[PDB]
Design a protein around this ligand. Structure first.
Ligand code: PRP
Ligand code: PRP
Ligand code: PPO
Ligand code: PPO
Ligand code: MG
Ligand code: MG
Lengths: 214, 214
């Protein structure tokens, strides 16, 4: 069950057919996933995490380090699906850090930095959430680590998956927009305190990255 | 300012004059504040917070146990003012706990259930967001902490300030409302993993109140 197939070629769109912010003009090359574009995916993607997990007291858990947004919305897009229909969705939140090699250079390590609180999770229906799923390196550790305790279930929803070759080949179970090995930002994809007000997941420029480097 | 302040004789509104979930029917008494009054009210706070705290870098940390939304939103509008205006304020967002109790009656305890990491909001105008200020035991503690590492500036946030005889005495720096002393649920206020898929901060009836007694 793939996702928004996006070949190594999708030209993208000009960054002047939308409302990108001036102070993010230089550092930007080409819009990728229009903001109103994403919403709709989740706007529907939430209507899946309900066709299986529906009739069960569900538990939502989010991976942090800068992944709030995509986390919120989807959740907001479920609260509604509870009321506006016959099939209930009683729930209990959850949160967790799991850190991240938060830069841009190429990928190889799993450094935890918080949010181990899961003792509870035991004996219940749980789904994870994440921005994105790059080389699935750290997530794996997570899912790995999300093997020790013991709950009723553990799917794995996520908006962005990466056809990065580094991928050990870990297919989640909820992928919004499958994409190529590149660097995107904006809308719960931040780059060291930047691009949090850019709703259009665009590709930072080989030059932009160079403005915010750590 | 306390902003949208509510007296006492406030009859809220009949839940039938608004769109409030079915099951969440019989369980509610009457409706306090509409979802709307918030979307718009909150929004403001962003434009108010934005002011005092403008061209800067602010660590937006929140407190946690059950409510994430309101905060989320309080960020959104903030995000926007930068893209829909001539201002910038790079941000950092931490997800604090000082975890709570979530109940009725008698007080006197504080034990952090995660999110412990105050070793970073240094020389920076922090950002603390509480879905609701009730007694003060938490914010007090936490407020009486961040000031330690010595952040550049501290400013409060509270969607709902709950006026009560039993109260710490404190006054958040940016209040949206100042609601009386009732058990309100909806929009980032909940009751033992219930009443969450309710945009309306309605009140819990003298029925559904005992429909999930602790
Ligand atoms: O599975 P992997 O290939 O090892 O990498 C995945 C991790 O990297 C991402 O970082 P993030 O630190 O970027 O935060 P941010 O979401 O805005 O950028 C994301 O949160 C993942 O946990
Ligand atoms: O009595 P006080 O000292 O004033 O305590 C206040 C806290 O307790 C409440 O519950 P809850 O923490 O469970 O929630 P959360 O994640 O949404 O804040 C509320 O959110 C306040 O933050
Ligand atoms: O900003 C980012 N931070 C961490 N990992 C990735 C990012 N963009 N693509 C992958
Ligand atoms: O009314 C309330 N309902 C749920 N939780 C809390 C409340 N006040 N403080 C915490
Ligand atoms: Mg992550
Ligand atoms: Mg709170």
């Amino acid at each position: 069950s793939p996702g928004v197939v996006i070949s190594d070629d999708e030209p993208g769109y000009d960054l002047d057919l939308f409302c990108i912010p001036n102070h993010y003009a230089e550092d930007l090359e080409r819009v990728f996933i229009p903001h109103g574009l994403i919403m709709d995916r989740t706007e529907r993607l939430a209507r899946d995490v309900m066709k299986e997990m529906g009739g069960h007291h569900i538990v939502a858990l989010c991976v942090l380090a800068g992944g709030y947004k995509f986390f919120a919305d989807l959740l907001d897009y479920i609260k509604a699906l509870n009321r506006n229909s016959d099939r209930s969705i009683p729930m209990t939140v959850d949160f967790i850090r799991l850190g991240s090699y938060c830069n841009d250079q190429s990928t190889g390590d799993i450094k935890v930095i918080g949010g181990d609180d899961l003792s509870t999770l035991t004996g219940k229906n749980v789904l994870i959430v994440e921005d994105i799923i790059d080389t699935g390196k750290t997530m794996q550790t997570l899912l790995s680590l999300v093997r020790q305790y013991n709950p009723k279930m553990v799917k794995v929803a996520s908006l962005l998956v990466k056809r990065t070759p580094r991928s050990v080949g870990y297919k989640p179970d909820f992928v919004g927009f499958e994409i190529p090995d590149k660097f995107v930002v904006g809308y719960a994809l931040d780059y060291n305190e930047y691009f949090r007000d850019l709703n259009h997941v665009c590709v930072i420029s080989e030059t932009g990255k160079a403005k915010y480097k750590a």
